[PDB]
Amino acid sequence: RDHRKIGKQLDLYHMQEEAPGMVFWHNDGWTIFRELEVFVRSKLKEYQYQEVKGPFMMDRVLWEKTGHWDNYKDAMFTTSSENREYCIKPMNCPGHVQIFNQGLKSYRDLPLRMAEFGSCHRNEPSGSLHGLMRVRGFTQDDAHIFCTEEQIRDEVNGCIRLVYDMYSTFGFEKIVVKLSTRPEKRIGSDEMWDRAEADLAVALEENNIPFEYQLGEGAFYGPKIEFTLYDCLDRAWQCGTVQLDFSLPSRLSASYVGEDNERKVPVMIHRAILGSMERFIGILTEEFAGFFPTWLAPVQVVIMNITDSQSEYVNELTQKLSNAGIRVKADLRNEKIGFKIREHTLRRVPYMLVCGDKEVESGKVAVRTRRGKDLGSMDVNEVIEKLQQEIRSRSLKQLEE
Amino acid sequence: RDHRKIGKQLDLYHMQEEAPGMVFWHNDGWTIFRELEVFVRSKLKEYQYQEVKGPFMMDRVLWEKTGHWDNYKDAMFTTSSENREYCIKPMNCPGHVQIFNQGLKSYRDLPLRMAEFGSCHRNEPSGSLHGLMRVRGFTQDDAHIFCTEEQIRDEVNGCIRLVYDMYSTFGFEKIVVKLSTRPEKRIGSDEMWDRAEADLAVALEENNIPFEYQLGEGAFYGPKIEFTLYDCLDRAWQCGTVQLDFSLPSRLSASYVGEDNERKVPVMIHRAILGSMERFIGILTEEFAGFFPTWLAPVQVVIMNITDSQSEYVNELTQKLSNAGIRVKADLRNEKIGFKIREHTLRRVPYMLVCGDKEVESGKVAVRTRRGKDLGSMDVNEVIEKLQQEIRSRSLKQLEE
Numbered sequence A, B: 001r002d003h004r005k006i007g008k009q010l011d012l013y014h015m016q017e018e019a020p021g022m023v024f025w026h027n028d029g030w031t032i033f034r035e036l037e038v039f040v041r042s043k044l045k046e047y048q049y050q051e052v053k054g055p056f057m058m059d060r061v062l063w064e065k066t067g068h069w070d071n072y073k074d075a076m077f078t079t080s081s082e083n084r085e086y087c088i089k090p091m092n093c094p095g096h097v098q099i100f101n102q103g104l105k106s107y108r109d110l111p112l113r114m115a116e117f118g119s120c121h122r123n124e125p126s127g128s129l130h131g132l133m134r135v136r137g138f139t140q141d142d143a144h145i146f147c148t149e150e151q152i153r154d155e156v157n158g159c160i161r162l163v164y165d166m167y168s169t170f171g172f173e174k175i176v177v178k179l180s181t182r183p184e185k186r187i188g189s190d191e192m193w194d195r196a197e198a199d200l201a202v203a204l205e206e207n208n209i210p211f212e213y214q215l216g217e218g219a220f221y222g223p224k225i226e227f228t229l230y231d232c233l234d235r236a237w238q239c240g241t242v243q244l245d246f247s248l249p250s251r252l253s254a255s256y257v258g259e260d261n262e263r264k265v266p267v268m269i270h271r272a273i274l275g276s277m278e279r280f281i282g283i284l285t286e287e288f289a290g291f292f293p294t295w296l297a298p299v300q301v302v303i304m305n306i307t308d309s310q311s312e313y314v315n316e317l318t319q320k321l322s323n324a325g326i327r328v329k330a331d332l333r334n335e336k337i338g339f340k341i342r343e344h345t346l347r348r349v350p351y352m353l354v355c356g357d358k359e360v361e362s363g364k365v366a367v368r369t370r371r372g373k374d375l376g377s378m379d380v381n382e383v384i385e386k387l388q389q390e391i392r393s394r395s396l397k398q399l400e401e
């Protein structure tokens, strides 16, 4: 179930020598990416997050202030313009603080949950690159929550609940959690680390999550909870993550007026639920072996005619399903129906509707699935409603199975 | 009228010295950006385009092959990794050709219309930067159409129709068209340029579009039909564009198998309809003076109480409108009704619903608009249906106006 092989076979993406670790998302792969964005956004609305977009690069000076230059320089790409040096962003946090810093903030504005599908670039050693799992350019379903110390418990718990909420949709049987503590190179005092590490351990236990410590693997700015998912060879990949930061906001001069009218520095919680779209799609591709649940399938339905006699009917049905919000395509090629069915089956299209004369006269469609199940003739409106239900619910199972 | 002043007043975005010409999109500005993407995607579906995503950077060698290095070096940002040099993409075309080159192509695959909301970076002189109109980092609603020479007429015509189609949604009364001819520094033969320039001129005539030539302003790879829109000072800004390229495909070894079964090089049409999301939003902001059509308004409705007596009712209606897909906010502050209305009018919020005792008892709301009008009390469900229609149809006018 190598996602690199499935990606090629289903025409999802490709990579080349001229752009090591850089993904070229083909139409079908990009459709999956976009559907995941829709899913995340639905949750961003439910869990009350703003959504922003920061710049691709910022002056080296800013990255020096955050501690990224001294603790993360080897992973950063740099460029220049008019005698000034810039770092292509490896993280979205600094840009979020810049947005937070615009306009006076009050305790009444906290917690302020700021999300972004942020494109990050990291100069990963070429020898460590691996398909979609470890790339140099990726998009994180990132967010930074600015809050008070008293709000930490509730906000971290909210992030944890969001992870299991979203992961439940995919039916992940194996989710391993780790708590990564203070690394050798770090910012912040030992006292701050004691408190932050304790806050995350308490959160994990209060949520009934068994976890193991991963000494010295925390971020330079804070400890981190790692939600590990596994590929087909059972290799561990860090996907979701929650990090507790008491240092970056201060370094970037973030503050708010407290209920006491005094200037305070907000705590910042960093979290990514899927991790990166690239890595998450890599995990899903191997988990489903290419049989993506209908709500995620690049093409959900393909309608085929037996002969030119049913072409008009097929076009009408295709427009009807399309107007119903289904990703559907008509296959009116001059090929044998058995040839068309095999092609789409190999592409793992969830449903294939075949239209012969009896279907046209009947106003029905012959339905079969990529698994080879023959559902027989069904009423068009019946199939539309069943499909909409499967899609809307993001069900892992297809009609009857 | 200035979009920079309006952008500040409505908290849409900000820019700062650590990232010259790089936009920080705040929640509200990003909401407009996203609605435009949704709008564009609805047209991509209607006009039959695929949507992809290419990498942010590629090896300098690739840019040397396309002619970008010799003819566009000054506008490109470069970076490196492991003794290799890369150029941050200033255009999406090369990446699209790389995607096209994956897998054998046949004449049956053409025309192949490939779109992308492509993030481009160009090292524009700092002195030329201007708000959202001329930036260093922007997103183009780009696309490249691969086709046969015989399909050029229809594909160019389709792009031209797409431009007026999309622009009509915004009600632009001033769209100026120019045909930009061969620049001093260019690739390709005189014969190729005469042919491409003539093809575009004929397409304009066929559509009865009056235009003027703009000498030497075409791209180094081909001539361009330029659609200019104007700002509050009546300054021209290039937005939509359609370009004919007989050079890039060949330089990047693109080809397809024709009906005769022989290797052919595809023609490529480049086109952006809005131009860049940044520049288009700048144009819209000034065109509407901040009075964004309801479908684009960051906040579409604000519901307010008179006294705490109506607070629960306001909260109920807010959730109700939110569930109906409307961008709504509640204003429960202890301020006079006039005070609240003046504030949200300055924020250009389309509708303000006032809830007094009468409203709470009758299950209605008193409607006021940002244009200083009083629409009287209306039934809540009727308001929702009407707003949904105004949004769904992307109407330029509010209720009864």
Ligand SMILES: Nc1ncnc2c1ncn2[C@@H]1O[C@H](COS(=O)(=O)NC(=O)[C@@H](N)CO)[C@@H](O)[C@H]1O
Residues within 6 Å of the ligand: A090, A091, A092, A093, A122, A124, A132, A133, A134, A135, A136, A138, A140, A142, A143, A238, A239, A240, A241, A270, A271, A272, A274, A275, A276, A278, A279
């Ligand atoms: N090289 C990479 N390739 C693919 N995905 C990556 C790569 N590096 C990081 N990620 C993903 O991005 C997630 C978040 O990255 S992180 O460095 O752990 N944390 C962040 O950067 C924090 N700034 C998030 O707010 C990771 O959990 C992982 O899933």
Ligand SMILES: Nc1ncnc2c1ncn2[C@@H]1O[C@H](COS(=O)(=O)NC(=O)[C@@H](N)CO)[C@@H](O)[C@H]1O
Residues within 6 Å of the ligand: B090, B091, B092, B093, B122, B124, B132, B133, B134, B135, B136, B138, B140, B142, B143, B238, B239, B240, B241, B270, B271, B272, B274, B275, B276, B278, B279
């Ligand atoms: N510096 C800039 N700031 C904002 N928008 C820009 C900038 N440069 C270009 N654009 C927008 O991007 C559009 C397309 O750019 S272009 O160079 O004319 N053409 C392209 O790059 C072609 N490769 C499109 O396929 C322009 O019409 C303009 O609206």
Ligand SMILES: [Zn+2]
Residues within 6 Å of the ligand: A091, A092, A093, A144, A270, A271
């Ligand atoms: Zn972060």
Ligand SMILES: [Zn+2]
Residues within 6 Å of the ligand: B091, B092, B093, B144, B270, B271
């Ligand atoms: Zn182009």
